[PDB]
């Protein structure tokens, strides 16, 4: 189900994560910072529990959640939030709500790389990761 998610991937590539964390309101130090870091993602399943690590010199974070069960979620950029995460025509798709605001982080697998897409108000954001 979730199956083909699972496993360690690299960021090859990222357009527009500027404008995406510009439009959250991400001051421009942890922008300029956050253009050049190259995270590896981690996604991990024990039973109903994915937990799913983002590692980078400058930045790490971690969560655990089951799918289609809210969360509370403190964002890389210190956003404390609600998240769901659920499996939607074999994508994971990941919704934040906070203040009102939502954004959608979107995982994809094309051509066997993950693709992350990143939408709040009209900006959006593509990352490309590859398997380890
Ligand atoms: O997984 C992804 O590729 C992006 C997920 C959506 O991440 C964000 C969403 C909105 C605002 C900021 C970010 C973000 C993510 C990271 C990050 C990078 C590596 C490891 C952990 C976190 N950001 C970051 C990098 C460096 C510094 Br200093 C501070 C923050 N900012
Ligand atoms: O662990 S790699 O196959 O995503
Ligand atoms: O562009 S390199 O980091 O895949």
Known sequence: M???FLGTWKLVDSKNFDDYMKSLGVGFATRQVASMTKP???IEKNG???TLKTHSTFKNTEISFKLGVEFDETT???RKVKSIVTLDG????HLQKWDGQE???VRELIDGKLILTLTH??????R?????
Do not use: H, P, Q
């Open 121 to 126: 108000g009209t900006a959006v954001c593509t």
């Open 2 to 4: 979730v199956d083909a």
């Open 76 to 78: 890389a950029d210190d």
């Open 103 to 105: 954004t959608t982080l």
């Open 90 to 93: 074999g994508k994971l798709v």
């Open 128 to 132: 490309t990761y590859e398997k380890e």
């Open 40 to 42: 590896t993602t981690i």
């Open 48 to 50: 109903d529990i994915l």
